[PDB]
Design a protein around this nucleic acid. Structure first.
Lengths: 148, 50, 150, 100, 49, 49, 99
DNA sequence: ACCGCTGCAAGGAATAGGATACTTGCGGGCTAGATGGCGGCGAATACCC
DNA sequence: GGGTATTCGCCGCGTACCTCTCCTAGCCCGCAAGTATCCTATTCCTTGCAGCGGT
RNA sequence: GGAGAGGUA
C-alpha cells in the first residue's frame, strides 16, 4: 500500500525518541495504516504528549505519510526523489490536467521531461531535506488543485 | 564448439568531432586539455622521462 | 612441487589468487613457473559466456590448474580437484579459510592444502592468530569447533 | 509446494542446478535456474513460469530477492551457504511468505 | 615522523644541553660518547676502553 | 563523490522490521506436509550411496 | 612519480605516469649553533664512537679452557648482513660460524 | 518490365560501466589504558673407559 | 655402570644527594578485495527494405 | 610510580 515517496532521507522513529521496540512498531503500524490527515494529526499529538519533541526523522516520517496520503487519492503510484531530481511514476488512470501538464512542460522543459508512458523526470538541486519536502508539497498541492 | 571469443575492442571512435582536431599536435602551452580518464587539465609542453 | 605432485597423480589444482586486476599476470607467471600444467583463469568479473565455459572445461579435465578468485569459496564440488594453493592467505577469515580448505578432498584420495603467507614478521597479529588456528584444526568434523571458535 | 533454493553465487547456482536436475531425473518435477548467466529474455520467461506455477524448484542467486520474483504457492525455502548473505537477505523472502 | 621524533626527542644520545656557560654549550656539542645504541654499556665496560 | 562522509543516521531501523517479521512468523501456523512412505522410498533408492 | 604499466601491452610499457609533491614527515632543523629545539628545550645530539664495520682479528689472552693458551679469532662484521666468525679450537683446529 | 542482388538501415541483444548491498580484512585517528661483560659455581650433559 | 671433562645457565657487581625529559593501545569507521543485483548508455549483430543490374 | 641522560662527594 506504500506508494513510496522515498526521498533518500531518513524517515523513521529513532531509538532515543522511543526506547522500547514494540511501541515503535505499534506507531509504525498506526501511521502507515492511517488514512486521513486528521488521524495523522492525532498520532502526532499522541507522540508529542507521550514523548515530547519530535526529531527530524520522526517529522520526516510523518510528512512522508501525509504525502503518501495525498498521492494515493491523486493517483501518483511512485513519487521518488534524490539530490539531483526525481521520477514521478503515475497510475494507469491518473488525474493530472493534460493541458496544464503540457503548459508546465513548455514553460520548464529543463525541469519536466516525460520518459516513458507514466514516468516524468524532474531535475532539481534538492540539497536540503526540508527544502525538498516543501518542494514536493507545493508540487503536489499545485497538482491536486487542477485534478480532474 | 570452439571459443566464441569476439570481445577484442569496442568502437570508441564515436564522439570524435572538431575537439579531437585530428591530433595536429600544434597545441600551445597553457591551452586546456580534456583527458577522458582523469578530467580537465592545462597542457604544459613535451618532456622526456625515464 | 605441489602442482607437480598433483599433476602426476592425475588430479587438478585450485590456485587461488583473489585479485582480478593481477590475475592475468599471476596465471601467466605460474604458466612459466610450471610449464607442465595447463592453466585457465576463472573469476566472477569476466563475461558470463566465458566464465561458464571455463568452469565447464574444468569439470571435463581440459586443464589442471585454475587460477581463481574466492568465487570457489562457496562450495563447488569438483571431486577430482585435490590440492588448493592459497597465494596470500594472511587476509582471509577463519570461515573463508576453512571453506577454501573444504574444496579439496570430496573423494577417496588424500588432498593437501597450502596456505602461502608472506614473511611472518610482515603479517599482522590477527593473521597469525587466524593461521595458527586454521592449522591447529585439521580433522574431519572440525567445521563446528572452528565455528564455535570464530 | 515450489521449493526455492538460494545460493550466494552463480557457480553454486549452476552446480546445484546440475545436481538437482540429475537427482530429479525420473519424476515430473521441473527445475530451473535464474541468475545473470540466464539471458534477459529467458529470465522473464522463468519469472512468468514461476508466477504461473509451473516451475517447482527455482535455484537462484540474490535475484530471488528482487521483488519481481513472485512465487505462486511457496512452501519451502533452502538457503545454502548462509554465511555470505546478511540478515536483510535472509528475511527478504521470509517477510513476503510469513510461514515458509 | 615517529621514527625521527623518537630519535630526536627521547634517545640515549639526543640529550639535554648543559647551558650555564658559553664554554659548557660549546664543549657539550663536541663530546664523543662511547655509549648509546650500538655501543658498550656504562657499567659493563672494562679497564681498557 | 564525497565518500568521506558517513551519510545519514541509520536510513532505516532494523529492530522493528526484524521484530515484526519474527512475530509474524511465530504467530500463525505453517503448512503441515503430508509424507508418503513408499513414494519417498523410491527417491531414497535413487541415491547411489 | 607513480608509473602505471598497462596490462595488455608486453612487459614494460607506460599507460600513465602521475607526479605530485607529497609531504612525508617533519624533520627537526639544527639551529645556527648545533642545537635542536625539540619541545621548547634546546637539546644536543652527541657524536658516538662505535665499532667500525670491517674485519677484526682479536684473541682472548689465555682466559678460557684453563689451558693457558691464546685462542685467536677473526670476525667479519658487515654494515648490513650476517657476521662471519673464524676461531681457533683449543686443539689448534679452525672453526667457522655465522651469527 | 519482372526478378535477383547488394548496400543500408533499423531493431533488439549483448556488453560496458556506474551505483548499491552482503561477507572478510586492515590501517588511521581519537580517545578510554638478536649479535661490546666477566668470574664463580654447581648442575647438566658429552665422552671415554 | 661410572668417573672425568666440557659446557651452560644463574647470581653478583658501592652509598648518599641534585637537575632535566619522557612515559598509549584499542576500537570504530572508512578504505580495499571478493560476490551478487539493477540501471543506463553504447556497441554489435541479424534481418528486412529500397535502389540497381541481368534477362 | 618507572626508564633515559647528566652532575656533586
Amino acid at each position: 500500500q506504500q506508494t513510496e515517496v522515498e526521498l533518500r532521507m531518513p524517515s523513521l522513529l529513532p531509538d532515543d525518541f522511543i526506547p522500547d521496540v514494540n511501541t515503535r512498531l505499534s506507531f509504525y503500524k498506526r501511521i502507515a495504516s492511517a488514512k486521513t490527515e486528521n488521524e495523522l494529526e492525532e498520532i502526532k499529538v499522541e507522540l508529542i504528549d507521550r514523548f515530547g519533541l519530535l526529531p527530524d526523522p520522526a517529522r520526516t516520517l510523518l510528512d512522508i505519510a501525509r504525502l503518501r496520503q495525498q498521492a494515493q487519492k491523486l493517483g501518483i503510484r511512485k513519487l521518488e526523489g534524490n539530490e539531483k531530481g526525481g521520477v514521478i511514476e503515475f497510475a494507469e488512470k491518473n488525474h493530472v490536467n493534460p493541458a496544464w501538464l503540457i503548459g508546465l512542460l513548455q514553460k520548464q522543459p529543463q525541469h519536466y521531461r516525460l520518459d516513458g508512458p507514466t514516468r516524468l523526470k524532474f531535475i532539481q538541486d534538492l540539497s536540503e531535506r526540508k527544502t525538498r519536502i516543501e518542494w514536493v508539497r507545493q508540487f503536489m498541492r499545485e497538482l491536486e488543485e487542477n485534478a480532474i | 564448439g570452439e571459443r566464441v571469443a569476439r570481445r577484442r575492442q569496442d568502437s570508441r571512435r564515436t564522439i570524435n568531432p572538431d575537439t579531437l582536431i585530428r591530433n595536429l599536435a600544434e597545441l600551445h602551452i597553457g591551452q586546456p586539455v580534456v583527458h577522458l580518464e582523469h578530467g580537465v587539465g592545462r597542457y604544459a609542453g613535451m618532456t622526456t622521462l625515464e | 612441487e605441489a602442482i607437480l605432485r598433483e599433476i602426476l597423480r592425475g588430479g587438478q589444482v585450485y590456485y587461488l589468487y583473489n585479485d582480478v586486476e593481477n590475475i592475468q599476470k599471476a596465471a601467466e607467471r605460474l604458466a612459466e613457473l610450471v610449464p607442465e600444467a595447463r592453466i585457465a583463469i576463472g573469476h566472477g568479473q569476466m563475461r558470463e559466456r566465458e566464465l561458464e565455459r571455463v568452469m565447464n572445461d574444468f569439470h571435463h579435465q581440459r586443464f589442471n590448474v585454475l587460477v581463481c578468485t574466492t568465487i570457489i569459496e562457496t562450495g563447488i564440488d569438483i571431486p577430482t580437484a585435490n590440492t588448493i594453493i592459497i597465494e596470500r592467505a594472511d587476509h582471509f577469515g577463519l570461515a573463508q579459510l576453512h571453506q577454501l580448505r573444504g574444496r579439496v578432498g570430496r573423494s577417496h584420495h588424500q588432498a593437501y592444502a597450502w596456505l602461502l603467507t608472506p614473511h611472518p614478521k610482515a603479517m599482522t597479529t590477527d593473521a597469525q592468530k587466524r593461521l595458527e588456528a586454521i592449522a591447529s584444526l585439521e580433522d574431519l568434523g572440525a567445521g563446528f569447533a572452528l565455528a564455535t571458535h570464530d | 509446494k515450489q521449493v526455492a533454493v538460494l545460493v550466494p553465487t552463480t557457480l553454486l547456482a549452476q552446480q546445484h542446478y546440475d545436481n538437482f536436475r540429475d537427482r530429479f531425473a525420473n519424476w515430473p518435477v521441473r527445475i530451473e535456474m535464474i541468475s545473470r548467466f540466464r539471458s534477459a529474455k529467458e529470465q522473464t520467461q522463468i519469472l512468468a513460469e514461476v508466477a504461473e506455477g509451473k516451475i517447482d524448484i527455482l535455484i537462484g542467486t540474490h535475484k530471488l530477492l528482487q521483488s519481481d520474483v513472485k512465487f505462486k504457492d511457496l512452501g519451502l525455502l533452502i538457503v545454502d551457504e548462509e554465511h555470505r548473505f546478511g540478515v536483510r537477505h535472509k528475511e527478504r523472502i521470509k517477510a513476503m511468505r510469513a510461514n515458509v | 615522523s615517529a621514527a625521527v621524533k623518537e630519535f630526536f626527542g627521547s634517545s640515549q644520545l639526543s640529550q639535554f644541553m648543559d647551558q650555564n656557560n658559553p664554554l659548557s654549550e660549546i664543549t657539550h656539542k663536541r663530546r664523543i660518547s662511547a655509549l648509546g645504541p650500538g655501543g658498550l654499556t656504562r657499567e659493563r665496560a672494562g679497564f681498557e676502553v | 563523490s564525497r565518500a568521506r562522509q558517513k551519510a545519514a543516521e541509520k536510513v532505516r531501523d532494523v529492530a522493528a522490521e526484524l521484530l515484526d517479521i519474527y512475530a509474524q512468523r511465530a504467530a500463525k501456523e505453517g503448512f503441515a506436509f503430508k509424507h508418503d512412505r513408499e513414494q519417498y522410498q523410491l527417491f531414497c533408492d535413487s541415491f547411489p550411496f | 612519480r607513480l608509473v602505471i604499466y598497462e596490462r595488455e601491452a608486453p612487459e614494460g610499457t607506460v599507460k600513465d605516469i602521475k607526479e605530485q609533491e607529497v609531504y612525508m614527515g617533519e624533520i627537526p632543523l639544527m639551529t645556527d649553533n648545533g642545537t635542536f629545539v625539540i619541545n621548547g628545550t634546546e637539546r644536543v645530539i652527541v657524536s658516538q664512537l662505535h665499532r667500525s664495520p670491517g674485519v677484526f682479528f682479536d684473541s682472548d689472552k689465555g682466559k678460557t679452557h684453563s689451558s693457558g693458551k691464546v685462542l685467536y679469532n677473526a670476525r667479519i662484521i658487515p654494515y648490513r648482513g650476517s657476521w662471519l666468525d673464524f676461531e681457533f679450537d683449543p686443539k689448534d683446529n679452525l672453526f667457522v660460524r655465522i651469527d
